[PDB]
Design a protein around this nucleic acid. Structure first.
Ligand SMILES: Nc1ccn([C@H]2C[C@H](O)[C@@H](COP(=O)(O)OP(=O)(O)OP(=O)(O)O)O2)c(=O)n1
Ligand SMILES: [Ca+2]
Ligand SMILES: [Ca+2]
Lengths: 397, 953, 392
DNA sequence: GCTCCTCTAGACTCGACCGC
DNA sequence: GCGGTCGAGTCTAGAGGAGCT
């Protein structure tokens, strides 16, 4: 069975079979994630945010608009925002001439806003605010997770996690190497096959040096993250005028920082992690415990159903208050055999399966099944939450 | 013309060089010898073969002093070794007052004259000294105290760390944090003591040389590995009274005797800390003085004997020049160390994760009792401990309804909490999981608990079963009576699934009683299978305990020790184990190298004013602790640097040699001798048979063979019986060293386990029997070894007293036949060093000796003198080859071995300039992330053009 | 002025010309600084938890920012036009008046369109999520995303829940959602009376409700509820009906659609206004900065290792901490306290020589403005307890 | 041909607190 | 009263060296 079909059945991917092809998945022109896929991507984005901001010094959140001011660049392919009302007016109000229509079409390429293709421009506009926040100290950084639009005609949407790192050029190379190593380690942390995450140096048309991470998809390698060593040109272009406001304190001296652009693709990263999980035997998605959308699954059988469901509802409330995702399989009206339920949970990358039987009302013991070992362990209810928290904490660090 | 030939049609040296080196006249070859050589070559089909002549070389060599080439080398060595032998003789004739009563405590050197009067001095201010350095191992590599003796008065020195009560110092060392000091510094294992000297790390060379009593002991009364083993076991045996180990106590007992030295049981430097060293300062100083006096007595009793057994001064000058090794390093060394360690840790983590995944996937065989059919996990404990006990859519709920539902759910959940008393106070450890999986997982009570099988490791007996390792298509099996092994299916005599073994072997044979090996071992009695042990290096009697040992890496690279089923993470773990073997086995030595970084002030003006220089960079030097004579063969021994390791695309940390980088303004000029030992054996055979190069079949093949075309000895040996080049090279080198037929048989069985003992014996006999190609070369080796005083046929260096026939009778012949060739090679190295130093001093070439690995020579020469250095290397090689021929009675030299094939000029110590040295630790390359352009390899013709055929600037 | 205080503390960003009430309410510029972004993220997390995690049969939905686009004129959403086409039109064959008219018509007839509401995003995923729940009604789809509305394009981040129900139980579910949303909005506000509700009627007569916050200039709609019926679902799924029928007990029915949509940018602005010596008393579950670490009287290395560990401690636990010890400027204690008050810091931690001596760290509470001593080992547990308490 | 050592690691064995 | 885990004790195979600290 193909992995894409399994993901579609278990709601990791969404769309028609025409949208489940490799080209359609890579394009990003359509919503390609179900609720489980959305939760997996949210977990991946939260891990990236924690690693790159929370545990890192002088990295701050930045918000940027999807629209950018219009530009007259020679070959910008970014789609333009045109008001339909203005077009309707022009075309059915005063009947202009051919030259007037030519001018109107020219104006659409001179004042119409454009959808952002990268998050680099958004972070640069907030450079002064972050300079003021850090008392003009260096090195600081800006991180943002958002949607970037890319031409494919059709428009493709891809979610980008971008870290813009400001640092003096004297440490630009060491910072670039450290960031490359850290990103490689972060991508290989949750990978069952870390050897499939590669790295290679690339050069742009302007001669700048940089790296580019890869993942070995079955069809071939795809760039899941790119690092660029951009000079001071970007900051100067974004702030044409006095240089005093652009300079940052490199200790006892004021230096214009060198911009490092670290750009990851979390949609392609989630696809890569879904491919890494499947072995490519029991069909099971061996997602990392920090990335599994569902960690605990509850079930009820051999009633009385009222007491068992009340106990399961109490356990669900207890687990949710501690930040554990639980799939309430007891509320399902249609019941299936435990073999099919176990197969479904394994295909959904559910870490643990909890079964609350009628014997639980007497001694409090529940049957705990693990995804990794497919072994059932009798554990007491009061000790389930602590075990799950300890397991998640150990799997995190 | 400039072309000279030989009666065997071998191109000889050109007239221009021949008249300068060997003079004019010569002697007409004898008709009988030429006829015998022609008949011998015709019998082997090595006569009349075509040979393309090489272009003639004309060069004006520098004035060779004396009549012959030998007198020139003697004069050079005597001029180089005069100011040091003068100091050595002064030490021999020195009279020294007894040890001082009370040592001083102030910083710096202290001079102790008569009656033990203390007097501080900045430096000893003496020509000759005997040295002994004590360093606090716990504190660091910086020396702590040092006691030295002089012909005038005693001296002592203590570091500022020992004296001053300051807090912890910086990690990086400086020349100002070392012992201050022509000059001669003597000691036991003086290579270690040399590394603690300030002036020894400057880029410019100071006139200081070191005599190591251990090297002289090995040259005089050294012990072989078997001799060392016998001497250690005991303490035909008449040689034990004249030989001793490299310890100072054993040497003192052997050469001076008297009251034997006793090692201090306190071991403050080895084991203690700074406080203990401070507390017992006087006793430590007394022990150091005892060691210094013992070394002085050893030197007094050794120097006349060493000069009598090694009368040629070239040997002494080379030994003095082998002890000044200087490996320059920069800030890239720290990078390399950090990258290698990080890669090693990452690969260990990945391998552990793969093993945990294999263990987790192995548990699924419990269902349906499928583990009984697994070829590997059938015998494990799969028991399981039992647990121990002591409608239409309703509408939305209202606020009261949801509140009461939540509170009653909470109360119902809290009611079950009272059942904690009903549970045993000692919880079970994973009763549901099988027995073997319980061991691999830490208990929940453990404060160091980790999820899954976190206790699994490579060294356990279940890892090979989880990885499904197979030996030539046979699953591995551990027998308590015989260790590890493998099961061969097909026998017709929990039960092991022999049908599964048969199916697996059928699959392996189709996709890629009938087996020979360590023995069927019917005592194990596994139904349907036989139990053949894994071949151990020590022998069939011994039993293996781990198939992941360092002795199985060649066996698994050949495709015999393969991971079978579970191929997702199975073979990946084996690949990771192969990748990190070198770093695992040698990270302690590499990371503990004593690196000292020079200040910018101490750097010469050339380095600071170079375009490649960087102000933020640090340039340092690693001084190898090379024992100039660490074996009976007098070859330098160093586990970290003096090895055959080279950068590999699948080894972590293999590029350590590439990290030795020349400083700006300087370049590393090197050259590797092409088949040095083979050529030495060939020329010995030629001088023994008929007195002319190429008379022997072995010499003719050595001179005319070419690796590329496929006529060399190693390629022909490999093609004769079908072996790999490296294995054939090992075979041929062992045979030349004197290995018997048993060594050949064991090598054939080890390289190809499919060979039986009888077939290996037959193949070894056929190879050794080839009236053969190397008979005369060997007869010569046996004659030299069996003489009354076996001396080198070039410099006349006498053999170790522990190997003379007067004390060993007819024993230890395989050692002496190897000693002849290896000591000839060492004398060749000595001649090379003497000639190189003479050429550098005469024509004012700025450079110094860097390192001598195996048959390679490296010199840190200024860049502006890189071609002059290459021409000097070519001239020295020509002179050494001509001297070797002259000492054997041959006043000529073949053109094919007269000059180097390529004199490397590179910024690092890589094996070849074309290599990029990509390794899991440095995947990009040397040039990509360090700035090391490829070097230039030049032949003699290219060197002549760029130097105008002269050495003067 | 609250706007200036939030701009100087990095809650609000932009030029002073963009700090006007109209500019703030339009959403045409990124109006939040890093502290404002963190506060908005905290509010979004609270909304997501309360509406999905603690709710039955509510699932995540990810939808594109562009819609297939159509000729329907009433549409005012900005369109997506490839600039390359226009360049080809203007720098090539050079067509005429009629061809330019045809090209302009094709832009409105067939081209992309920026979304104005998240309602259509969930309706496209209705079938897949219906199959996920085994067609068991009721179930809802929640999504927090940015929507574009013409004012220049204004961007507003909208949290929307599409609650599919049978027709009979529409009113009860709508009222339950209204009361739940009102309670959720009033939970984080110090002045719950400022939040209010008022019934409203759609153009097509569909009944609904709105939630307002009393800003100092007036009432602005922060959340709007509608009873859309089956019109939208049938519009999005023409043809067969059996593929959009949920299960209501034994009988099948096309579910009614309830639209629960709130603006989290305007909600963040309202909570900033409600939080307002200048002190911002943000709710502890919403405050962007909870822990402030400070040093005093030296020594430098040891105290920084102390504060550094107390920081990895609170970061591993999951508590956001402002590293006020790494600041090179040695500002006064009262200035630091005032700055932390302005930045809505929950608790301030002071590390002095006594901490090296005994191990006690002085803890200052923003609400009570009192200084108390506490051991290092008990700081994490106290912070976790305090956060848990506030969250309930 | 082929000793010794000190060492780490692993696994089998047996006495022994302690809870049932 | 008795057996269940647990903590050393020991036995053994691999590894590093046979120098100086
Ligand atoms: N099997 C071997 C090979 C080499 N050496 C020694 C003798 C040489 O002087 C030195 C370097 O030899 P290399 O193997 O590096 O090169 P070779 O001299 O063997 O030439 P080739 O590699 O072309 O066979 O190492 C040895 O003892 N045993
Ligand atoms: Ca010494
Ligand atoms: Ca060579």
């Amino acid at each position: 069975e193909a992995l894409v079909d399994l993901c579609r059945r278990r709601h990791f991917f969404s769309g028609t079979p025409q949208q489940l092809s490799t080209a359609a998945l890579l394009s990003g022109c359509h919503a390609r994630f179900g609720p489980l896929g959305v939760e997996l991507r949210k977990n991946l984005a939260s891990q990236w945010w924690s690693s790159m901001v929370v545990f890192r010094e002088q990295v701050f959140a930045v918000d940027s608009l999807h629209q950018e001011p219009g530009s007259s660049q020679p070959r910008d392919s970014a789609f333009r925002l045109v008001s339909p009302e203005s077009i309707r007016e022009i075309l059915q109000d005063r009947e202009p001439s051919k030259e007037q229509l030519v001018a109107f079409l020219e104006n659409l390429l001179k004042t119409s806003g454009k959808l952002r293709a990268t998050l680099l421009h958004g972070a640069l506009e907030h450079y002064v605010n972050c300079l003021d926040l850090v008392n003009r100290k260096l090195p600081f950084g800006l991180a943002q997770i958002g949607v970037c639009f890319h031409p494919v005609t059709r428009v493709g949407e891809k979610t980008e996690a971008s870290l813009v790192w400001f640092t003096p050029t004297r440490t630009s190379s060491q910072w670039l190497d450290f960031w490359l190593r850290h990103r490689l380690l972060w991508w290989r942390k949750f990978a069952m096959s870390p050897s499939n995450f590669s790295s290679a140096d690339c050069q742009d048309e302007l001669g700048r040096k940089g790296s580019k991470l890869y993942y070995s998809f079955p069809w071939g390698k795809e760039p899941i993250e790119t690092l660029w060593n951009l000079g001071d040109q970007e900051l100067l272009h974004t702030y044409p005028g006095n240089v005093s406001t652009i300079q940052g304190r490199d200790g006892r001296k004021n230096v214009v920082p060198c911009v490092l652009s670290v750009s990851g693709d979390v949609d392609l990263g989630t696809l890569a992690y879904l491919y890494d999980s499947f072995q490519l035997q029991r069909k099971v998605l061996k997602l990392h415990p920090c990335l599994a959308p569902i960690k605990v699954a509850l079930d009820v059988g051999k009633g009385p159903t009222v007491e068992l469901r009340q106990v399961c509802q109490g356990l669900l409330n207890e687990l949710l208050e501690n930040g554990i995702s639980v799939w309430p399989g007891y509320s399902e009206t249609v019941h299936s055999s435990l073999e099919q339920l176990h197969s479904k949970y394994d295909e959904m990358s559910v870490l643990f399966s909890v079964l609350v039987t009628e014997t639980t009302l007497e001694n409090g013991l529940i049957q705990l099944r693990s995804r990794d070992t497919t072994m059932k362990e009798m554990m007491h209810i009061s000790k389930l939450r602590d075990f799950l928290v300890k397991y998640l904490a150990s799997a995190s660090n | 013309g400039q072309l000279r030939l030989n009666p065997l049609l071998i191109q000889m040296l050109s007239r221009g060089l021949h008249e300068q080196i060997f003079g004019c006249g010569g002697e007409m070859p004898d008709e009988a010898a030429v006829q015998r050589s022609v008949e011998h070559l015709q019998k082997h089909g090595l006569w009349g073969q075509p040979a393309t002549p090489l272009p003639d070389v004309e060069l004006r060599l520098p004035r060779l002093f004396g009549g012959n080439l030998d007198q020139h080398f003697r004069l050079l060595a005597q001029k180089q070794s005069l100011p040091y032998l003068e100091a050595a003789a002064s030490l021999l004739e020195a009279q020294l007052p007894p040890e001082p009563k009370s040592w001083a405590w102030a910083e710096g050197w202290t001079r102790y004259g008569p009656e033990g009067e203390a007097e501080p001095v900045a430096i000893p201010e003496e020509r000759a000294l005997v040295f002994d350095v004590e360093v606090c191992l716990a504190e660091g590599t910086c020396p702590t105290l040092a006691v030295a003796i002089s012909p005038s008065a005693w001296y002592s020195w203590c570091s500022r760390r020992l004296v001053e009560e300051r807090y912890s110092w910086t990690s990086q060392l400086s020349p100002a944090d070392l012992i201050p000091l022509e000059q001669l510094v003597v000691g036991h294992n003086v290579s270690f003591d040399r590394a603690h000297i300030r002036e020894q790390y400057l880029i410019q060379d100071s006139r200081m040389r070191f005599l190591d009593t251990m090297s002289m002991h090995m040259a005089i009364s050294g012990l072989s590995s078997f001799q060392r083993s016998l001497w250690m076991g005991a303490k035909s045996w008449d040689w034990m009274d004249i030989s001793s180990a490299n310890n100072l106590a054993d040497v003192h007992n052997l050469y001076v005797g008297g009251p034997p030295l006793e090692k201090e049981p306190r071991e403050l430097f080895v084991k203690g800390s700074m406080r203990d060293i401070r507390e017992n300062f006087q006793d430590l100083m007394q022990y150091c003085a005892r060691d210094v006096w013992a070394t002085f007595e050893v030197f007094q009793q050794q120097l006349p004997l060493f000069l009598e057994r090694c009368p040629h001064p070239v040997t002494l000058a080379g030994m003095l020049e082998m002890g000044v090794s200087y490996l320059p390093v920069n800030q890239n060394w720290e990078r390399y160390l950090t990258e290698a360690q990080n890669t090693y840790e990452e690969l260990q983590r990945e391998m552990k994760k793969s093993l945990m995944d294999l263990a987790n996937d192995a548990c699924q065989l419990l269902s349906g009792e499928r583990y009984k059919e697994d070829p590997w996990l059938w015998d494990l404990e799969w028991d399981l401990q039992e647990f121990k006990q002591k409608q239409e859519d309703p509408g939305p709920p209202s606020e009261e309804e949801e509140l009461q539902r939540s509170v009653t759910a909470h109360n119902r959940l809290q009611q079950l909490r009272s059942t904690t008393d009903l549970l045993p106070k000692r919880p079970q450890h994973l009763p549901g999981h099988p027995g073997w999986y319980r061991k691999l997982c830490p208990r929940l009570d453990d404060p160091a608990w980790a999820p899954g099988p976190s206790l699994l490791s490579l060294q356990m007996r279940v890892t090979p079963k989880l990885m499904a390792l197979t030996w030539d298509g046979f699953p591995l099996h551990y027998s308590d009576s015989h260790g590890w092994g493998y099961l061969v299916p097909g026998r017709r005599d929990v039960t092991c699934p022999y049908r599964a073994i048969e199916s697996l072997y059928r699959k392996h044979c189709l996709e890629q009683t009938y087996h020979h090996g360590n023995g069927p071992y019917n005592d194990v009695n596994i139904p349907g299978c036989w139990f053949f042990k894994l071949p151990h290096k020590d022998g069939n009697n011994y039993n293996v305990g781990s198939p992941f040992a360092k002795d199985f890496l060649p066996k698994m690279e050949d495709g015999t020790l393969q991971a079978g089923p579970g191929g997702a993470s199975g073979p990946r773990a084996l690949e990771i184990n192969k990748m990190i073997s070198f770093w695992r086995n040698a990270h302690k030595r590499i990371s503990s190298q004593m690196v000292v970084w020079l200040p910018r002030s101490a750097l010469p003006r050339v380095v600071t004013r170079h375009p490649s220089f960087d102000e933020e960079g640090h340039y340092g030097a690693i001084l190898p602790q090379v024992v100039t004579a660490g074996t009976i063969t007098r070859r330098a021994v160093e586990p970290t640097w003096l090895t055959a390791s080279n950068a590999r695309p699948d080894r972590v940390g293999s590029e350590l040699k590439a990290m030795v980088q020349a400083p700006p303004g300087y370049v590393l000029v090197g050259a590797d001798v092409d088949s040095q030992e083979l050529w030495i054996a060939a020329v010995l055979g030629d001088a023994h048979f008929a007195g002319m190069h190429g008379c022997t079949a072995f010499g003719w093949m050595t001179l005319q063979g070419r690796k590329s075309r496929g006529t060399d000895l190693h390629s022909k040996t490999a093609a004769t019986v079908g072996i790999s080049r490296e294995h054939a090279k090992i075979f041929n080198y062992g045979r030349i060293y004197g290995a018997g037929q048993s060594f050949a048989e064991r090598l054939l069985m080890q390289f190809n386990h499919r060979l039986t003992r009888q077939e290996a014996a037959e193949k070894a006999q056929q190879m050794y029997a080839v009236g053969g190609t190397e008979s005369e070369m060997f007869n010569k080796l046996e004659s030299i070894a069996m003489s009354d005083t076996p001396r080198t046929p070039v410099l006349g260096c006498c053999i170790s007293r522990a190997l003379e026939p007067s004390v060993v009778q007819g024993e230890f012949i395989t050692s002496r036949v190897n000693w002849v060739v290896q000591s000839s090679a060492v004398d060749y190295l000595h001649l090379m060093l003497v000639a190189m130093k003479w050429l550098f001093e005469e024509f004012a070439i700025d450079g110094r000796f860097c390192i001598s690995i195996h048959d390679e020579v490296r010199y840190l020469v200024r860049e502006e003198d890189r071609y002059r250095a290459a021409l000097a290397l070519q001239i020295t090689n020509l002179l050494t080859r001509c001297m070797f021929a002259y000492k054997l009675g041959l006043n000529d030299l073949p053109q094919s071995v007269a000059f180097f094939s390529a004199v490397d000029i590179d910024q690092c110590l890589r094996k070849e300039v074309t290599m990029d040295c990509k390794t899991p630790s440095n995947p990009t390359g040397m040039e990509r992330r360090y700035g090391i352009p490829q070097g230039e390899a030049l032949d003699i013709y290219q060197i002549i053009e760029l130097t105008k055929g002269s050495l003067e600037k």
